[PDB]
Homo-oligomer: A and B are copies of this chain.
Amino acid sequence: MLSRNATSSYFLGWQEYEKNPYHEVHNTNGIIQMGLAENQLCFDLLESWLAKNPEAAAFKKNGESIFAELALFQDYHGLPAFKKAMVDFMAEIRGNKVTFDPNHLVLTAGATSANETFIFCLADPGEAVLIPTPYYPGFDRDLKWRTGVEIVPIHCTSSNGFQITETALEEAYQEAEKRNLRVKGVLVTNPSNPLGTTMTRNELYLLLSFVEDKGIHLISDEIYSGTAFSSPSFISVMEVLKDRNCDENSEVWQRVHVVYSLSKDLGLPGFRVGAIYSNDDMVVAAATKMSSFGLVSSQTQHLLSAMLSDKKLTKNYIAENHKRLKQRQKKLVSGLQKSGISCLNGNAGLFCWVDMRHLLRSNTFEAEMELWKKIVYEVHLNISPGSSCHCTEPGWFRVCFANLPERTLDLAMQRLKAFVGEYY
């Protein structure tokens, strides 16, 4: 009797790309990848740093080999130097408006591991967490698969730019009741995937007030925090906790947590560097013990400790990343406009939330899937349909702009315009 745990367009389109991937030389007619949120815009900056500072990657420290020491380093508290470099980098991303205690930071194998661990720590099987829609498709697996925890949506609509409202929060909490589920917290993504927008101060205060009243937790996945390239300003959930008489007052501050990773800003998803940050000593202790199942390679911790300790590098990287991200997003927005397609006004992330409602046969998700399939097979472009992100409104699509060359992006825009000018 095989177990239970051992026994979706987002993953579908991805596989379709694998079958016939685009190549500017071999398969110039293949499918162009615009459905995965990755950042290939600044590798030259990191490659340059590595060329000038070869010691870290060589298992050398102060001209001394520390291969053996690192090979043996498996402490679940993480490499001291790396934890310090990380909290400093997290502070810098936030304009030094907030500071993080390295003893309250827990390293994990990517945010994928961090989010699951947070759920294991805050909710028991059969309980639930509330999540604003639309949200990252991966959460359906990360937060529920091995945890036995359920997701209850906090529906957001285009009427107000997909922002969280009081009514949406209570409606979600009430649906949790109808489903006989006990709510343990709210998990938000700030900046938002797939919206490409930074959370507003208003939304943050609304969330804090809500979790305070309900006596639950607030987890903020801020993996895109370093990718805010245009106004308005990114506001970490930890900044709102600063001045509000909650530093050492109230008790809600103990229930606010952050998830981070180096996958999206630095473009290092393969290195699996994730992190959990909590003000609650017990959560930190539990998460630390849990990190045993997904520790970060000491080889990687050492390399990045050296990299992130270079203040000239971090400063220039964030600045250039913002510059290149803004330029690329503008190119996508401009390219889509030429096809009469608009986007939700965004300012962060590695993608745009695109409005293709006017291209639907009808206002239904069935019509959305029809359009999606047509874009995949006829236009040969892989983008994500809003339904994969649980958007309540048919017609929205997530289009990633930083995981391919600029020229390939232009090609994608050309092929899309030919498509719209052909049928509509």
Contacts and interface: CB of A to CB of B under 8 A. Distances in A.
Interface string A254-294: 00000000010001111110000000001100100110111
A293 B293 contact: yes
A346 B303 CA distance: 40
A300 B272 CA distance: 11
Given A110-B295, A269-B74, A290-B146, A58 B54 contact: yes
A47 B74 contact: no
A71 B3 contact: no
Given A38-B72, A47-B65, A295 B109 contact: yes
Interface stretch (A114-122, A167-175, A370-378, A414-422): A114-122
B270 A297 contact: yes
Interface string A51-84: 0001001110000010110111110000000000
Contact of A299 (B70, B116, B299): B299
A50 B43 contact: no
Contacts of A141: 289, 292
A90 to B, nearest CB: 20
Contacts of A59: 50, 57
A243 to B, nearest CB: 28
A6 interface: yes
A289 B141 CA distance: 9
A280 to B, nearest CB: 9
A298 interface: yes
Contact of A67 (B7, B50, B54, B120): B50
A252 to B, nearest CB: 15
A136 to B, nearest CB: 13
A204 interface: no
Contact of A293 (B74, B109, B184, B297): B109
Given A68-B40, A125-B125, A270 B299 contact: yes
Nearest to A290: B146
A267 B300 contact: no
Contacts of A294: 109, 113, 293-294
Interface size for chain A: under 10, 10 to 19, 20 to 34, or 35 or more residues?
A: 35 or more
B272 A74 contact: yes
A97 to B, nearest CB: 29
A6 B286 contact: yes
B298 A271 contact: yes
Contacts of A57: 57-59
Contacts of A142: 292-293
Nearest to A44: B68
A407 interface: no
Given A47-B67, A109-B272, A293-B294, 11 more contacts: A2-B122, A3-B123, A40-B68, A43-B71, A57-B58, A71-B271, A72-B269, A141-B292, A272-B296, A299-B300, A300-B300
29 contacts: A2-B122, A3-B121, A3-B123, A3-B124, A5-B120, A6-B121, A38-B72, A43-B71, A47-B65, A47-B67, A50-B59, A54-B58, A70-B270, A71-B267, A71-B268, A72-B269, A74-B263, A109-B272, A109-B293, A112-B293, A116-B293, A120-B146, A125-B125, A141-B292, A142-B293, A271-B299, A272-B296, A297-B300, A299-B303
Lowest 4 A-B CB distances belong to which pairs?
A270-B298, A294-B294, A297-B297, A6-B286
